[PDB]
């Protein structure tokens, strides 16, 4: 038995967004819930306590409830500060242990960014180290969320296809880089690849062609 | 191995 | 205040075995449990067991009894937790929570608080290795450099020995299934200048010792 | 003076052509027979052909039939040959010399005299690439590091920036199959000084602009 | 059909070295035999044609002699200036034109001869992570200045992926070389070991190593 | 092709010929 | 969490003395010092004493002795500041901090970390005293009611008992000279709706029990 | 001896702003100075302690610096939250005690200039029949906190009588301060008009009442 | 009262000691 | 590992101020204090500041230190002649278990206006080739305040190996005077087309080129 | 007063070792802990160790270890550094530091005061050597004579027995890596001059009892 | 060895503690 927590949730700021976290009898149903605030790049932070107790340091923000299996944490009035991943505990019975959420990425909502695409083909070098890399590279797109494709002359192509999760940038817009990798011969061997980026519905197309 | 309660286990893992 | 410091990053190979440290301030020791917990990348926080370091019992999860001893030190205000026989099901952050427990006049339970920084243990069967440097060539032009093939983290990459930081952008790494990792950085540069300046990039891969420094220039 | 003045040297890629010039001075260009031979690097002499600058009649070892052509320019005094459909296993020193003949009063040959200077050509596919360098761990202890898969020459090693000159040997690099060089540079140095002193090697090639300081240790 | 002549020749200051060119009936034994002195950075230089006759300003030091398919050049009273490549050449009937020897390699001695020293590398673990490997093996501190060097993988030679680099003079007026095998990793880690082998002057000196 | 002597050959390319069955050879020709 | 819990606020006749609350959690309570600070309104903070609640030591700054005593509780792990002859010049906010010393090992001082939220106390020979409420009355129009001559704080003012909340807005009492607090509260309304609606605000002062109910309307 | 400190700084968000704390040989010279900023209605949050050293949740933008009896508190890249009161702290060797600066108010300048809206309300009919007036003046929605108030008597300044408020702030972010002029009904219907002059920014606003018929 | 550094005065405090500079001159002092 | 990094050099006019940079890291001067001491020619060195802005008794009160973070600075007022020697920052190390040291500072009290070095490079000589070495030779002088760095380079690559240069040392006119020496086999110099020694001073490089010839 | 003298200068051969003593006096010496430290010419100071002169405890840089011996004699008051195994790298002036330790009262750092006037070690396998002396050949000429290896310093040059002294500049010497010394000497002179004048240059190196001349014209 | 502040490595040498 573990805790059941939507994947993600957003809102524009000074809004009020509700997060749910879904348990069992054994957990919820007798046990305390417990929420936690997940900085990218800090400890967790204990927000509520109890089901509803806020620690000396947390805002009035926040604000805990619960009904039988199930409980939710409210943030009302959000702010930049409180884009962070948010998690549910509560002791099991049977596990005789704690049992955590999956975790919600909230992420407070500026305006919607295409990215922007570039595509490198392997260097001269590298092929003449009998290896081929082509370099997608994704920026400046919000929010934070890319679909990447790979095409070889218009066919999909799958396999040795590396994709990185987004990651923050300087401006809070997104940043993402995808990989290709493939021998000389496959990248000679046709007229040329195509790496498709695809935000919110929309795609952007790069293409590269072996050079003679 | 048996199911106890949060406030039971933690009263018998303190003392 | 209360403080819980905790290890630094690990790198080991399969079948090893890991201990990391779990130092504690500002509190009586002995008066708090300690929790043990890890999160593997993009899956939830699964706990593994916990301690009384007043007497040193401890408990452990049922998936990871025979494998997970916790302990601590009184002296030193530390509690450890080794993991052995490690595969690469066992790479997560690894952190440490002391257990504030329950108030008795209230009946209220005080949360888990605070927390450690967390541990990175990485499990690989890759060694160390330093990076191939590749340039990237295509209004405005962009110039990169491809380090390919290292590990492990991390990799850090500067622009004419740190001159040039304008338009400079470096992606995070990706994890191939080779084992190693390659991450690219790229410049934007007016076209005009594209030839008559000179832009390098600068790699440091401390791990294995590497400096490079290459040159990307349009083809 | 009786002089064979050669061309300058060649690169060209596999499957082309080159053409290579003699011009003859100090003696009747159309009175003397031209041979055209070859030598390989560390292999021995091998005859190409040879052409009479009047006649112009030339003939071939059945080596080269249909593969190389040598022409007479009797106004310039030049001859010509040249060789089609070049491989890696065509790079040589091309070298052209007179036939001094036999004397008919003596019955004697006279030899081939004089010799051209010879002309370089090499034939790879390979174009710029930056080294990879790899540490080589092994009283004295012996290690180094080794700089593989570059082209073209030269590549410059020095250790600590210049500061470690004594026990330096900088070997000179080998041409592999794939047309890459590779060398090795080896420092040896006293058992007792790995534990308190580093020693990191400084590969230097200018034609790929590449830079790269490794640190070679025990393994 | 071609020309056999000694790898190398070597003597003191002021003697007489002999070196030989072996032919058949087709080349040497029909024909005439011309020997020629290849200086570093020079053109051939005619010493002897038609098998004894040596062109004006060759000095007399310089003796042809020819007997049926075999030939002989004699050098006497050595010079430091004599030190160079000498070959010889003949007309082939069968192949209608010029065959050469291999040349020989004649040192004037101004050291006592020295036994090579010889350090060998396995591949380091960065290029067996890199899908290479590498065995480096280094000569160096031996005169005349010719070495051959052999491969063996569990005593069966090996020489496919041997690169060996010409000896070249070096500070101390002796020579060094350096042999280069490459192989997969999956070659290296099945064999017990490995050993370089450099014969210099009828004389080996081996080094082995193991993948570990 | 057939095997030919080194003289042979030497006269054949310089006379313009395997039909030949101080001085060069266009000093001779002027000669005779 | 650290936290150090203040008693509320205090209004003392002069000459009286006031006793404030300092309740220590989140840690060993006689493991470090307490210190008693004040700010005077438009002032620089003021350093008063300090006490070691492990041994019950105290010490006080020049300027109060002979008024200040510092005490502590181990059991409730308080600590106690109690200040005689009060006078005018001792209205401020008073204040408790940890002093968390100085470090063994690297002989860095770590500061005075957490503090006390503060309590206000009021040294003023005014005595309780309920507000008289006056109408306020001049595209849109404001209307106001004037809540005079009230102490001590706080009053709080509320219009058709909560109904109306858009336009209205409350501004912070001013203190005169007669030892009295008087505030003002003002809602924009439209013009037409003038006429037709009524207006009322509701002021409820606690300390004296008093609720007073006023409605603003147009002179005539 | 006390800590001598500038009463107040301001900038725009994004920049450095630097907050000094003068002091002598027996506090600053031979003890360490600790920062502390102290937000409205909070108490006062350790920020520099040991004259650079941050706690944990105190970011890099905070900084500080000593030389001698002078030091100095570095904030970088202003923001919104940045707005407080911030104070030194240093032991005196002479009070064998704790001594702290006067305080500097930092406010980050994050809107434009703001005009203040000023309404004033004679006395009420029910007041004055109480033989008591009061003229209330009501200042709203100006920016930055600042406001100078002069109350006008047939055009004749008048200082008796006046107690202002200081400025607060207001849930737009701006400021709200108040005036009020206390007066016998005699010297109400003594004089033809009373005025409410309000200077912001160099720029005034001025209201008029007069006693009604 | 005498003029004391903030060391001094915290020591004398914590500890529970004003009558007092080496390391040789505590151990005979103690 | 964990070094001190200060300038290599300072200078201004007699009265003047000049301020000393080191920067260290947490281990060192984040976590410890930083000393600062004059070292003159020929005498040992001599204590300025202690515990970052201490002086102790007979250090006039020109010299004033600083601390900021793992940042620190020392600053000099009222340059007298006297002035002029090496100045060097000194902190405990943490990890180090030990004192670490800055490379010091060479501070000038310019008593004449700064001068551009002279310099002249020459081949080696035909009789040095018959000899088996090779020595190219950089002459460099009438430079001040008298702190230059060479750099030699082959074919536009820096060379680094077998360069011996001088430290800086005074002339008669009060100007500096040093030389570069690189030593080579005959056979690396007859390979490369050119040689250059580039002498920089006060951020200007003086080169001089030779031949093979 | 508080003084630290310093013994006198050292020089010896690689592969032995040097004791430096350090006699401290107007203070107690079983009160302050002593420092050793070095600095190599035109290099930063590097700590060596450490030691209580009452203790006797002495504590060492890993740069050290299993090296260098500091030891005590209270009854002399004198601190003892003995390094061993000396290399030309361990050439360096040796200096003594008294450690004024903290202030208990107020916790204040009191620092390094004061310091011996430190001793001059040199490491150098050298022995005496003549100089090599050899021409520098290029509307001012310049032209000079390159003084190459010799042992020990100083060595005198002069131009035309001394009639010539305008336009003549003596660099002081550099010490390579082999240990000898090397300087040059350039004298300016007309271009005209040049065809009817010579100039010679007088080496003088009076440890070998050497006296050089040599005559440098236009290549 | 464990880094160990400039004060504790001071009184330690001049105390007699490792």
Same mark, same amino acid.
């Given at each position: 038995?573990?805790?059941?927590?939507?994947?993600? @949730?957003? $809102?524009?700021?000074?809004?009020?967004?509700?997060? &749910?976290?879904?348990?069992? &009898?054994?957990?919820? *149903?007798?046990?305390?819930?417990?929420?936690?605030?997940? =900085?990218? *790049?800090?400890? /967790?932070?204990?927000?509520?306590?109890?089901?509803?107790?806020?620690?000396?340091?947390? /805002?009035?923000?926040?604000?805990?409830?619960?009904?039988? !299996?199930?409980?939710? =944490?409210?943030? &009302?009035?959000?702010?930049?500060?409180?884009?962070?991943?948010?998690?549910?505990? $509560?002791?099991?019975?049977?596990?005789?242990?704690?049992?955590?959420?999956?975790? !919600?990425? =909230? !992420? #407070?909502?500026?305006?919607?960014?295409?990215?922007?695409?570039?595509?490198?083909?392997?260097?001269?070098?590298? =092929?003449?180290?009998?290896?081929?890399?082509?370099?997608?590279?994704?920026?400046?797109?919000?929010?934070?969320?890319?679909?990447?494709?790979?095409?070889?002359?218009?066919?999909? #192509?799958? @396999?040795?296809?590396?994709?990185? %999760? /987004?990651?923050?940038?300087?401006?809070?817009? +997104?940043?993402?880089?995808? +990989?290709? &990798?493939? !021998? /000389?011969?496959?990248?000679?061997?046709?007229?040329?690849?195509?790496?498709?980026? %695809?935000?919110?519905?929309? %795609?952007?197309?790069?293409? #590269?062609?072996?050079?003679? | 191995?048996?199911?106890?309660?949060?406030?039971?286990?933690?009263?018998?893992?303190?003392?």
């Amino acid at each position: 038995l573990t805790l059941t927590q939507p994947a993600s @949730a957003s $809102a524009t700021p000074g809004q009020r967004v509700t997060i &749910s976290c879904s348990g069992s &009898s054994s957990n919820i *149903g007798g046990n305390t819930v417990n929420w936690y605030q997940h =900085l990218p *790049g800090a400890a /967790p932070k204990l927000l509520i306590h109890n089901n509803d107790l806020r620690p000396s340091g947390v /805002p009035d923000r926040f604000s805990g409830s619960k009904s039988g !299996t199930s409980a939710s =944490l409210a943030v &009302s009035g959000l702010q930049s500060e409180d884009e962070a991943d948010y998690f549910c505990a $509560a002791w099991d019975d049977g596990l005789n242990g704690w049992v955590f959420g999956g975790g !919600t990425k =909230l !992420t #407070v909502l500026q305006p919607k960014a295409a990215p922007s695409v570039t595509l490198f083909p392997p260097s001269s070098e590298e =092929l003449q180290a009998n290896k081929a890399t082509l370099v997608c590279l994704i920026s400046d797109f919000y929010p934070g969320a890319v679909t990447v494709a790979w095409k070889a002359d218009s066919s999909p #192509v799958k @396999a040795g296809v590396e994709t990185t %999760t /987004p990651s923050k940038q300087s401006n809070n817009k +997104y940043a993402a880089s995808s +990989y290709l &990798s493939l !021998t /000389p011969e496959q990248w000679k061997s046709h007229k040329s690849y195509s790496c498709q980026v %695809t935000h919110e519905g929309s %795609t952007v197309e790069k293409t #590269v062609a072996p050079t003679e | 191995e048996v199911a106890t309660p949060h406030r039971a286990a933690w009263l018998a893992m303190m003392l």
